[PDB]
Amino acid sequence: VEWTDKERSIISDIFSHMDYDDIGPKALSRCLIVYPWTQRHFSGFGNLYNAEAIIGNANVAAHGIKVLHGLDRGVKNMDNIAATYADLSTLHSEKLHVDPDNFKLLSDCITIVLAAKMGHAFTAETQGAFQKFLAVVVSALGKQYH
């Protein structure tokens, strides 16, 4: 990945304004509703048969904040993202058994939740850069699946 100075600034600015506490639970919530096979990994969080049940689940909200904080290291390490995420990749594959396609799906849900929060500030060029970032992190998260 070659990043432009404009891409760095866009990504940098998005994560400095982002409210992890608002976006994380909504993005994970939306994913388990729009793509319910992602519920595979949230057994004992309580009952997730219902959108209200999902959006009110505390355990889902706390995991959506954790995943979103997991993006920080990529912002910090923009030219070394594959390596930064290697052990996280290895964990998802060998310990958690998370299908990596789920990463793409959550990524899109994050993009859509951010879009509703930023409004017309989420320009075409902003979406480009942001999706570019998520895509590179997603590729990374999928790298150590052996």
Partner: protein, 142 residues
Amino acid sequence: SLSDKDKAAVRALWSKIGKSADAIGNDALSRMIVVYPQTKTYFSHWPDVTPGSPHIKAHGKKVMGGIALAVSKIDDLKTGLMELSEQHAYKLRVDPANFKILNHCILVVISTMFPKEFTPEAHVSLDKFLSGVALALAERYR
């Protein structure tokens, strides 16, 4: 397949946002060509291919009027969109991969413009519906 619940959810949402179809197409098509520039191959015959240009604008109207049609033909998208399928299949030969791309762009545009209406339940049903629109446009291809 779309359940009654899905159909109801799409029609209620379109009831609320349909008035903005033209703005939605311009925005979504602009996003498509910017974020996914390989889609520009299909517009090589226009003078240029730029975000919110006269040609993108006018097409955006036409594409969303196609979505409008689909909401109205939601009980039978295959029959409802057959002429559009013939055009896309025989004249344009748009690879169906691209419909998934535009569909994503549409959802992002609606989130930006209708945050309160575009709930996770609205979103699952519209995503189901657009996947069905994509499959119906692909009906005459092979």
